[PDB]
Amino acid sequence: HHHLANTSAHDFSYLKFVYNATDTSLEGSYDYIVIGGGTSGCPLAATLSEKYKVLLLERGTIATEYPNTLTADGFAYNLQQQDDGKTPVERFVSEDGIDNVRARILGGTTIINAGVYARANISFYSQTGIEWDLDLVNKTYEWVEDAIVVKPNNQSWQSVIGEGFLEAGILPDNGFSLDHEAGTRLTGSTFDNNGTRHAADELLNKGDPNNLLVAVQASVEKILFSSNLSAIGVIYTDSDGNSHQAFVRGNGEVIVSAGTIGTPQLLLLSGVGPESYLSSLNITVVQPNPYVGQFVYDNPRNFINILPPNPIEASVVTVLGIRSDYYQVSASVLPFSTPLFSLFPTTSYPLPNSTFAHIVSQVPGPLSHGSVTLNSSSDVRIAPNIKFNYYSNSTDLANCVSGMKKLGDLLRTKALEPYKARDVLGIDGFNYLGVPLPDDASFETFCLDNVASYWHYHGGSLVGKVLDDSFRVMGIKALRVVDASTFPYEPNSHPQGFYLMLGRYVGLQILQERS
Ligand SMILES: Cc1cc2nc3c(=O)[nH]c(=O)nc-3n(C[C@H](O)[C@H](O)[C@H](O)COP(=O)(O)OP(=O)(O)OC[C@H]3O[C@@H](n4cnc5c(N)ncnc54)[C@H](O)[C@@H]3O)c2cc1C
Ligand SMILES: *[C@@H]1O[C@H](CO)[C@@H](O)[C@H](O)[C@H]1NC(C)=O
Ligand SMILES: *[C@@H]1O[C@H](CO)[C@@H](O)[C@H](O)[C@H]1NC(C)=O
Ligand SMILES: *[C@@H]1O[C@H](CO)[C@@H](O)[C@H](O)[C@H]1NC(C)=O
Ligand SMILES: *[C@@H]1O[C@H](CO)[C@@H](O)[C@H](O)[C@H]1NC(C)=O
Ligand SMILES: *[C@@H]1O[C@H](CO)[C@@H](O)[C@H](O)[C@H]1NC(C)=O
Numbered sequence: 161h162h163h164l165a166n167t168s169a170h171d172f173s174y175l176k177f178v179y180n181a182t183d184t185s186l187e188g189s190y191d192y193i194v195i196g197g198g199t200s201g202c203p204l205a206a207t208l209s210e211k212y213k214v215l216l217l218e219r220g221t222i223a224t225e226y227p228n229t230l231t232a233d234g235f236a237y238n239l240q241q242q243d244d245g246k247t248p249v250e251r252f253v254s255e256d257g258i259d260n261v262r263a264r265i266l267g268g269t270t271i272i273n274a275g276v277y278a279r280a281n282i283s284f285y286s287q288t289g290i291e292w293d294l295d296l297v298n299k300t301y302e303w304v305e306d307a308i309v310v311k312p313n314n315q316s317w318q319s320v321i322g323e324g325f326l327e328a329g330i331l332p333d334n335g336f337s338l339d340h341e342a343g344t345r346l347t348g349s350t351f352d353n354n355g356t357r358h359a360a361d362e363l364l365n366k367g368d369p370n371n372l373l374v375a376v377q378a379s380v381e382k383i384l385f386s387s388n389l390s391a392i393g394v395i396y397t398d399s400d401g402n403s404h405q406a407f408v409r410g411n412g413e414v415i416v417s418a419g420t421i422g423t424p425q426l427l428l429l430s431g432v433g434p435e436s437y438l439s440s441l442n443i444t445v446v447q448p449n450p451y452v453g454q455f456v457y458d459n460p461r462n463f464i465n466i467l468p469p470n471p472i473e474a475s476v477v478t479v480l481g482i483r484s485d486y487y488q489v490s491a492s493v494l495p496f497s498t499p500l501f502s503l504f505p506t507t508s509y510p511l512p513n514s515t516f517a518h519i520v521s522q523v524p525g526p527l528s529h530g531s532v533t534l535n536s537s538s539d540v541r542i543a544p545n546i547k548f549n550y551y552s553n554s555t556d557l558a559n560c561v562s563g564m565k566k567l568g569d570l571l572r573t574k575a576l577e578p579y580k581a582r583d584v585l586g587i588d589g590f591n592y593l594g595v596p597l598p599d600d601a602s603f604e605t606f607c608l609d610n611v612a613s614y615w616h617y618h619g620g621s622l623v624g625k626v627l628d629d630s631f632r633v634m635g636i637k638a639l640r641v642v643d644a645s646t647f648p649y650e651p652n653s654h655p656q657g658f659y660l661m662l663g664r665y666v667g668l669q670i671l672q673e674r675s
């Protein structure tokens with residue numbers, strides 16, 4: 161952990177090569193175009209720029225425009241803020257009826273998230289069947305961590321929860337570790353010890369400023385193809401609504417890094433997707449693939465909220481309780497009168513009047529899946545439909561049962577006993593905001609009725625379905641996808657670490673292949 165970042169201001173040096181998409185001089189040929197300046201997109205573009213001319217296209221603006229994105233304290237503000245179409249948080253509702261958000265900003269979801277940093281479960285690599293260069297994976301983790309990851313300071317609530325998890329039998333004590341392993345640990349954070357947010361945008365600082373150009377408020381509308389099927393370029397619109405073209409040249413490539421929602425949307429809009437679905441919308445099929453926008457996953461979040469009789473200190477999540485069937489954390493939260501959109505699954509949820517502990521469990525996988533479909537066959541700014549089918553798979557429900565029973569165990573610990581309003585023997589001694597924990601039937605109803613998004617959604621452009629083991633779109637030359645659309649299961653409890661790593665790792669695979 162010699163390599164970890166220090167406390168330091170958010171580094172915006174890269175703004176020297178960030179331009180408004182209104183600049184027509186950006187139009188032309190590049191070696192690489194990366195669509196979406198997010199978690200995977202930024203480190204991929206920075207890596208490619210070491211040797212090649214790169215255009216990164218991001219639909220959102222720069223984080224300096226929304227200062228509440230740059231601190232731990234600002235986290236709530238971004239979810240409370242109304243979505244006017246320009247804000248870094250884009251609000252949506254799944255067809256399941258569950259409120260949710262995605263990022264719309266340079267840096268992607270790393271600019272709005274809860275900061276928790278972990279490496280992938282070391283078993284993930286062989287699970288995929290991809291021939292990963294495991295030494296390069298680990299060096300690439302250190303390259304991310306060196307830039308943006310700290311060892312968090314002590315926070316009283318995280319220490320309480322950590323003692324609780326251990327007392328509740330989530331063993332062993334792993335101390336401070338970045339690794340996803342069974343047991344309780346302090347993990348890394350992309351919030352520094354001063355509360356400054358560090359994010360994927362800062363990895364642009366590792367790019368070559370002579371080779372990397374970033375266009376912001378660049379809404380990529382279509383992938384352009386040859387007339388040997390190859391991606392050749394993009395159409396993108398600017399904030400005034402004027403259109404622009406950029407192309408790749410020679411052995412160059414287009415990479416889509418537009419996220420679980422944005423990637424399948426743009427593939428479908430560009431005629432890459434299920435023949436009968438695109439034909440039904442009169443979208444000309446460039447490449448039939450029955451799986452674009454299929455196998456879209458949202459790991460369930462289930463939770464209780466306790467209202468201690470004495471104030472607790474607010475904390476960022478740093479302490480994790482990991483089993484193979486559930487991943488658990490808790491945030492301590494200040495009261496608010498404006499709700500944090502998607503913290504609770506609907507807008508009709510009680511407001512807290514005092515500090516509360518949000519105590520949560522995450523279902524692994526999950527095994528339930530749904531799909532992304534177009535709402536508009538022409539306009540990328542119109543959000544696609546998304547459905548996750550929470551708990552349609554009974555293994556997911558069985559796992560939520562186990563998780564909720566373990567949160568029961570946690571509330572019974574000596575660790576949590578001081579946070580009860582009444583010194584009675586049972587967990588009815590706590591005061592709850594919303595529904596308290598309840599044989600399995602009542603745990604099942606609790607799981608089904610009170611599910612929220614963990615925000616760790618993934619899928620829609622899966623390796624083995626749409627992509628090969630090199631992240632290439634099967635049947636198309638010069639087109640890759642690198643982002644959370646690529647895997648049907650989580651790499652770990654907190655996937656930003658994996659997707660930051662993946663952007664640079666695939667960039668290095670691209671540079672090697674080209675040698
Ligand atoms: C509120 C919240 C909290 C979270 N907390 C954590 C946590 O603490 N730790 C953790 O590990 N994970 C966390 N996650 C999950 C994790 O951050 C995400 O899974 C991950 O960042 C996704 O990376 P991505 O590259 O797939 O997408 P993104 O990072 O969202 O990148 C996609 C980018 O593409 C852009 N875009 C989309 N369509 C287009 C288009 N057509 N043209 C141009 N640009 C486009 C978007 O604006 C965006 O910037 C959280 C998620 C949320 C929503
Ligand atoms: C780009 O320029 C337009 C005016 O042409 C302006 O409205 C918009 O805010 C600018 N966006 C950025 C990111 O500078
Ligand atoms: C990669 O790092 C992990 C710790 O994150 C370690 O368990 C593993 O042995 C390393 N693998 C290789 C091939 O070095
Ligand atoms: C597609 O176009 C045909 C005309 O060629 C029309 O009959 C059909 O209704 C159209 N479908 C859609 C969904 O636009
Ligand atoms: C790590 O990954 C493998 C799935 O490949 C799994 O068998 C194991 O449960 C996972 N462990 C944890 C603690 O998530
Ligand atoms: C577009 O979005 C709304 C959800 O807000 C939905 O009711 C409507 O039917 C959608 N249109 C299509 C074609 O899916």
Ligand SMILES: *[C@@H]1O[C@H](CO)[C@@H](O)[C@H](O)[C@H]1NC(C)=O
Pocket residue numbers: 527552553554555
């Ligand atoms: C759940 O998931 C697996 C696919 O992984 C499948 O075998 C099983 O049939 C599904 N279960 C239910 C209850 O649908």
Ligand SMILES: CC1(C)OCc2cc(C=O)ccc2O1
Pocket residue numbers: 274276477489491493500503518520
């Ligand atoms: C938003 C708030 C209140 O603080 C951060 C937070 C983070 C996780 C991530 O594992 C889950 C829940 C949560 O709650």
